[PDB]
Design an enzyme around this catalytic site. Structure first.
Site, PDB file in Angstrom:
ATOM      1  N   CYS A  31      10.179  -4.230  -2.702  1.00 20.19           N
ATOM      2  CA  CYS A  31       9.962  -2.817  -2.429  1.00 20.19           C
ATOM      3  C   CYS A  31       9.644  -2.578  -0.950  1.00 20.19           C
ATOM      4  O   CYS A  31       8.487  -2.443  -0.547  1.00 20.19           O
ATOM      5  CB  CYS A  31       8.869  -2.268  -3.339  1.00 20.19           C
ATOM      6  SG  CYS A  31       8.593  -0.510  -3.076  1.00 20.19           S
ATOM      7  N   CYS A  34       7.218   0.167  -0.092  1.00 21.06           N
ATOM      8  CA  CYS A  34       5.876  -0.256  -0.471  1.00 21.06           C
ATOM      9  C   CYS A  34       5.295  -1.117   0.644  1.00 21.06           C
ATOM     10  O   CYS A  34       4.200  -0.858   1.130  1.00 21.06           O
ATOM     11  CB  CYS A  34       5.843  -1.063  -1.770  1.00 21.06           C
ATOM     12  SG  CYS A  34       6.534  -0.333  -3.268  1.00 21.06           S
TER      13      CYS A  34
END
Length: 107
Positions: A31, A34
């Site tokens: 991710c 993220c």
């Protein structure tokens, strides 16, 4: 305060059984958003010392709760005020917005 790390097991303690508020970032190494948001997550959590128990939950390693809650896409930053959930932010964000968004829920 500074963002910790959690998984299925620890989540129970660190999140569900929490006294003070909590900010759990459901993340993953794949991710990208993220990963680049994580420093922002941490420093903001640093600013919100004592109360905001910020944390990072690996969604790949701890899909369990992600499934229970109904999460897939990440970042999915859930907020808890005391054990139980309060709010949830999804996707990348500018720090100013994150700060304000936290403040309106906490102070």
């Amino acid at each position: 305060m500074e963002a910790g790390a959690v998984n299925d097991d620890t989540f129970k303690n660190v999140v569900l059984e929490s006294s003070v508020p909590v900010l759990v970032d459901f993340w993953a190494p794949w991710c990208g958003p993220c990963r680049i948001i994580a420093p922002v997550v941490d420093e903001i959590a640093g600013e919100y010392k004592d109360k905001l128990k910020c944390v990072k939950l690996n969604t790949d390693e701890s899909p369990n709760v992600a499934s229970e809650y109904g999460i897939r896409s990440i970042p999915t930053i859930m907020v808890f005020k005391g054990g139980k959930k309060c709010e949830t932010i999804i996707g990348a964000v500018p720090k100013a917005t994150i700060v304000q968004t936290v403040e309106k829920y906490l102070n």
